[PDB]
PDB file of C-alpha atoms in Angstrom:
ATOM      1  CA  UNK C   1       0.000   0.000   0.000  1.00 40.45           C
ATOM      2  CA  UNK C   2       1.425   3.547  -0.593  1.00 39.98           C
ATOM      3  CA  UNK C   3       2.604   4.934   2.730  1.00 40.27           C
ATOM      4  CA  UNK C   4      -0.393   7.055   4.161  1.00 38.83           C
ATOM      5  CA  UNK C   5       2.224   9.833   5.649  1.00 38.46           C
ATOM      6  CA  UNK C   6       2.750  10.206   1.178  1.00 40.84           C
ATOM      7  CA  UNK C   7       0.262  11.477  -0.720  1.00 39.74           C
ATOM      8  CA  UNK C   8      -0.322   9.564  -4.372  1.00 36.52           C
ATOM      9  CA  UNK C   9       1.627  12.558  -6.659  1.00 38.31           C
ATOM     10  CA  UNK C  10       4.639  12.603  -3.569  1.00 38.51           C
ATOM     11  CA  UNK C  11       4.390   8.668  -3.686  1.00 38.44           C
ATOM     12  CA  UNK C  12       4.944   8.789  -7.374  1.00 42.33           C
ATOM     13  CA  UNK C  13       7.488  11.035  -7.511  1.00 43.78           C
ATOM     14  CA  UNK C  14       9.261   9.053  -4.309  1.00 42.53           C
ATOM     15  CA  UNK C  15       9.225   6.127  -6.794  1.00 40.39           C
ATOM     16  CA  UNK C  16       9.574   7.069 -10.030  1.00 40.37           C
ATOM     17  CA  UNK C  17      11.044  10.821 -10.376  1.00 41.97           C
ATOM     18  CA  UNK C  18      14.775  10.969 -10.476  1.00 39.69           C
ATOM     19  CA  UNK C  19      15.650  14.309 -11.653  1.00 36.72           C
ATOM     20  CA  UNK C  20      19.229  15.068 -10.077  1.00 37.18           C
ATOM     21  CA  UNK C  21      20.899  11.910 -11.866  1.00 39.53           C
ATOM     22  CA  UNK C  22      24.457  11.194 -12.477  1.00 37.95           C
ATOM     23  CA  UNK C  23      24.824   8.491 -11.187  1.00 41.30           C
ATOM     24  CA  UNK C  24      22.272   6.502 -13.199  1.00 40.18           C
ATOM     25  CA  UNK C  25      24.803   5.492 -15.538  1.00 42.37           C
ATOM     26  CA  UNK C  26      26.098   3.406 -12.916  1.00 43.63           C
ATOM     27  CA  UNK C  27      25.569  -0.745 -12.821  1.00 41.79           C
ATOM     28  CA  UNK C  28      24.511  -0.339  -9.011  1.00 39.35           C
ATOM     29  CA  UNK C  29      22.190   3.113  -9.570  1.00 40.43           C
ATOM     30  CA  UNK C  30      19.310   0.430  -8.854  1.00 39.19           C
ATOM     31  CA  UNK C  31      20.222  -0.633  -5.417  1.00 38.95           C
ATOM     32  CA  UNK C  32      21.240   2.521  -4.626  1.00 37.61           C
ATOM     33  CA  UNK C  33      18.412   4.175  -5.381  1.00 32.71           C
ATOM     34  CA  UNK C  34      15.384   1.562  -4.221  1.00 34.11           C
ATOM     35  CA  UNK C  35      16.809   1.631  -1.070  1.00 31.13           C
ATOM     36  CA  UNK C  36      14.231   4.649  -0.052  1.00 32.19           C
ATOM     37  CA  UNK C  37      11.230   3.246  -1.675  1.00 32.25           C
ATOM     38  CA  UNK C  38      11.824  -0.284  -0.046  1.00 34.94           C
ATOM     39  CA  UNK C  39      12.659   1.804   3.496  1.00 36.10           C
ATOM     40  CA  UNK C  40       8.768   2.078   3.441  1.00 33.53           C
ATOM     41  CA  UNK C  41       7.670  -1.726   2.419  1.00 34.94           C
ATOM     42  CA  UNK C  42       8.023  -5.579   4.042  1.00 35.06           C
ATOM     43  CA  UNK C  43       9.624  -7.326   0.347  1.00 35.52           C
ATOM     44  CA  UNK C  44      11.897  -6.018  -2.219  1.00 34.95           C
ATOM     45  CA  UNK C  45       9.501  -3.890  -4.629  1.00 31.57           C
ATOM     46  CA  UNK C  46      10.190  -6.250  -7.307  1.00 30.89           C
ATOM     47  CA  UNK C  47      10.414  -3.641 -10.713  1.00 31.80           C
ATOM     48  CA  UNK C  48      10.365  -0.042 -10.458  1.00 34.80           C
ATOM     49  CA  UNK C  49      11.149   2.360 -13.123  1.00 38.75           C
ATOM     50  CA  UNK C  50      12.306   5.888 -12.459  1.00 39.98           C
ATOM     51  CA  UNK C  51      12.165   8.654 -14.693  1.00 37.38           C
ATOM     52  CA  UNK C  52      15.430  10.932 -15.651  1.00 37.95           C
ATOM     53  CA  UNK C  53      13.930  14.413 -15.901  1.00 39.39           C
ATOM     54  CA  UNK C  54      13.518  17.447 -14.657  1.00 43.70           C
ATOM     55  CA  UNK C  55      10.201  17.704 -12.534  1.00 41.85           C
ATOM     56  CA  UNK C  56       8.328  20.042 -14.562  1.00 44.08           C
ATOM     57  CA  UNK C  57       8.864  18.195 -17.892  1.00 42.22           C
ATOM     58  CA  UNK C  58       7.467  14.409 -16.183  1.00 39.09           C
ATOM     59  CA  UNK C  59       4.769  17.013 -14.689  1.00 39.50           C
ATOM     60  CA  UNK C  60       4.066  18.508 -18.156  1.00 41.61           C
ATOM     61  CA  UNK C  61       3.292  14.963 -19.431  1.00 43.81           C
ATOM     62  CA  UNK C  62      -0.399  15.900 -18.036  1.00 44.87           C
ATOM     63  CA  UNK C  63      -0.665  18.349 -20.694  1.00 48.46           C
ATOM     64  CA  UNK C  64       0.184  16.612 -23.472  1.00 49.85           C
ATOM     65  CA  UNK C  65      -1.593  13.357 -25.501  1.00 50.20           C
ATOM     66  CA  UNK C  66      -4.724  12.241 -24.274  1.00 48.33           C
ATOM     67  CA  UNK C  67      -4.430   8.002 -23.719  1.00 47.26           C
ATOM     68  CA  UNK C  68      -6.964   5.780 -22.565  1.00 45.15           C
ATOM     69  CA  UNK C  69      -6.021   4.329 -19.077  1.00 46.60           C
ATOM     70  CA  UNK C  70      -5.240   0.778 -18.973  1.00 47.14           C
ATOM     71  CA  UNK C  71      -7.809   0.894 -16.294  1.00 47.77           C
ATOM     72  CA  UNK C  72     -10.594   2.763 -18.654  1.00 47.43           C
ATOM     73  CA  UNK C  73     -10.680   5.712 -16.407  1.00 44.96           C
ATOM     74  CA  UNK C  74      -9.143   8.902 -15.501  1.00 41.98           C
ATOM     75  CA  UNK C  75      -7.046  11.010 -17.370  1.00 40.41           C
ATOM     76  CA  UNK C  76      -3.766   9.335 -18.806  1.00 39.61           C
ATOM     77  CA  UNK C  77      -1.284  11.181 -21.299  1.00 38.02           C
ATOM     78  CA  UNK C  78       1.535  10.030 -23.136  1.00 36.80           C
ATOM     79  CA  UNK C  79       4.777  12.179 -23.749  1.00 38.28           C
ATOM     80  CA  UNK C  80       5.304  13.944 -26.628  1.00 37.49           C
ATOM     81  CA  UNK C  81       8.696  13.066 -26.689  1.00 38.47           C
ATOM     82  CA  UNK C  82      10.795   9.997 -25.619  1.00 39.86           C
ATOM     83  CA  UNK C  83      12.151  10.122 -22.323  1.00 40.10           C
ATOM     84  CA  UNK C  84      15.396   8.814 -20.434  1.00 35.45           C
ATOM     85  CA  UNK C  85      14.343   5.822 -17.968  1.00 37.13           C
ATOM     86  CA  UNK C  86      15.862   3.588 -16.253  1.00 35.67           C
ATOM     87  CA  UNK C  87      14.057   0.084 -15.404  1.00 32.26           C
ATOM     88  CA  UNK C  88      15.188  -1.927 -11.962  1.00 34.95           C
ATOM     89  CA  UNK C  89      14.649  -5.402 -12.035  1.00 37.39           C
ATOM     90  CA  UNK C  90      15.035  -7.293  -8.593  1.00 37.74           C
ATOM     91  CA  UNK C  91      17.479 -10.006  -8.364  1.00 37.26           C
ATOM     92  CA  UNK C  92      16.335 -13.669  -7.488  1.00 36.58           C
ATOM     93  CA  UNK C  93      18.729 -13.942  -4.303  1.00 37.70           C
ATOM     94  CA  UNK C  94      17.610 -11.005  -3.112  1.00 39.00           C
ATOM     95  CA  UNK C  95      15.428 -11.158   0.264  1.00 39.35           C
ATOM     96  CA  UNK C  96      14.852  -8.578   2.335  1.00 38.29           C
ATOM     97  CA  UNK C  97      16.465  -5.962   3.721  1.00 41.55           C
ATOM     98  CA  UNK C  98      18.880  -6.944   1.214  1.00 39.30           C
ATOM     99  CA  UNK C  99      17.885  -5.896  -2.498  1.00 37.53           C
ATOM    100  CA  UNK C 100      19.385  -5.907  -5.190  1.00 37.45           C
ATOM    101  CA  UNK C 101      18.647  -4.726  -8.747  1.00 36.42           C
ATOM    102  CA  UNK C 102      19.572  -4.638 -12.308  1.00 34.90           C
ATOM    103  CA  UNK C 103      19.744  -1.307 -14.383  1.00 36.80           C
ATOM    104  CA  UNK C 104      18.328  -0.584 -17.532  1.00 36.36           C
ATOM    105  CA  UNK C 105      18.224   2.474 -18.922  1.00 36.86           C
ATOM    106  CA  UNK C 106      16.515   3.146 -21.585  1.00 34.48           C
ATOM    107  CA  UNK C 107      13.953   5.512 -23.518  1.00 37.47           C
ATOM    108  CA  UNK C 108      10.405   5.914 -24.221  1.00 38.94           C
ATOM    109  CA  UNK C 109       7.265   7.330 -23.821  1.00 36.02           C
ATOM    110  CA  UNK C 110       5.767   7.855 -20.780  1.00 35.30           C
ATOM    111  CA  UNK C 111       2.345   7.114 -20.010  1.00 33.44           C
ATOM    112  CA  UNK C 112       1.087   8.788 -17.096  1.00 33.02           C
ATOM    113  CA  UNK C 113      -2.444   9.179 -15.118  1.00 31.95           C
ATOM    114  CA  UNK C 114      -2.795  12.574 -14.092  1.00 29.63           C
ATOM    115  CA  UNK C 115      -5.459  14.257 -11.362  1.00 29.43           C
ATOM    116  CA  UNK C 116      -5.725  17.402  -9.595  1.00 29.33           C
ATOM    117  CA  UNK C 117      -3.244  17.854  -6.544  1.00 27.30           C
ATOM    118  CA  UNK C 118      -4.314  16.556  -3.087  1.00 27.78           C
ATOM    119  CA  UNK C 119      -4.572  19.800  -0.209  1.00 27.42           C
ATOM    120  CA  UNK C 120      -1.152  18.435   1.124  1.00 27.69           C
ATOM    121  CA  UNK C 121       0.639  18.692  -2.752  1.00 24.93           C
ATOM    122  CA  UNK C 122       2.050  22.251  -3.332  1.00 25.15           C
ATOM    123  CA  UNK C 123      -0.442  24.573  -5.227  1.00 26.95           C
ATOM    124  CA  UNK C 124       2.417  25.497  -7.378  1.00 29.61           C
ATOM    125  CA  UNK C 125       1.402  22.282  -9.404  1.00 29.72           C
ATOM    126  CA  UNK C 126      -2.144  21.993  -9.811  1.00 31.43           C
ATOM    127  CA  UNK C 127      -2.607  19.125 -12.020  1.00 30.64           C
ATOM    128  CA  UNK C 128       0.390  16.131 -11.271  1.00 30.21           C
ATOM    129  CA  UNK C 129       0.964  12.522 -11.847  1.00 30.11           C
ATOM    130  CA  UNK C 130       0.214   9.687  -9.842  1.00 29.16           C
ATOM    131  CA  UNK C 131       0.666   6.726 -11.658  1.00 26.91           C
ATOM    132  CA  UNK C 132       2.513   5.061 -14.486  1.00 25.87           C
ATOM    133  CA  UNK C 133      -0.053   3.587 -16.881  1.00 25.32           C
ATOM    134  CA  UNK C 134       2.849   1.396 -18.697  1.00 25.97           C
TER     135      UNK C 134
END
């Protein structure tokens, strides 16, 4: 479950906004960086994917293509552009507290579902991600 002290756009960005990211060309950027996300769980989160830019541009996905949710509802958008990513992919000895990944960056579009901020969320950003829809 997300961690109720999070709301869902702070949970998402927790997981899967890395914008200040040098050392995601590393082979261990994956362990290094799960380690905060799995701080707040009982199991290794098995496969996370984090997105490598700047806040407002994963925020300005909301604003851009209309998608169908996988779920039917809500408001998902895909970028415009492709984006840089890097997939983590849990390792089979790994049991925790001790997990480790495997990196993959790559790049593609990003779906996201989008909704307006929760009270708690700055009002700076009105309208922010929540989830990844693939």
């Amino acid at each position: 479950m997300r961690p109720p002290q999070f709301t869902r756009a702070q949970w998402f960005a927790i997981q899967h906004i890395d914008s200040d990211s040098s050392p995601s060309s590393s082979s261990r950027y994956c362990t290094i960086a799960m380690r905060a996300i799995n701080n707040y769980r009982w199991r290794c989160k098995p496969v996370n994917t984090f997105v490598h830019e700047p806040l407002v541009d994963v925020q300005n996905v909301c604003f851009q293509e209309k998608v169908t949710c996988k779920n039917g509802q809500g408001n998902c958008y895909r970028s415009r552009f492709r984006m840089h990513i890097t997939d983590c992919r849990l390792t089979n000895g790994s049991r925790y507290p001790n997990c480790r990944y495997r990196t993959r960056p790559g790049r593609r579009h990003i779906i996201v579902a989008c909704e307006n901020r929760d009270p708690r969320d700055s009002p700076r950003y009105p309208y922010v991600p929540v989830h990844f829809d693939a």
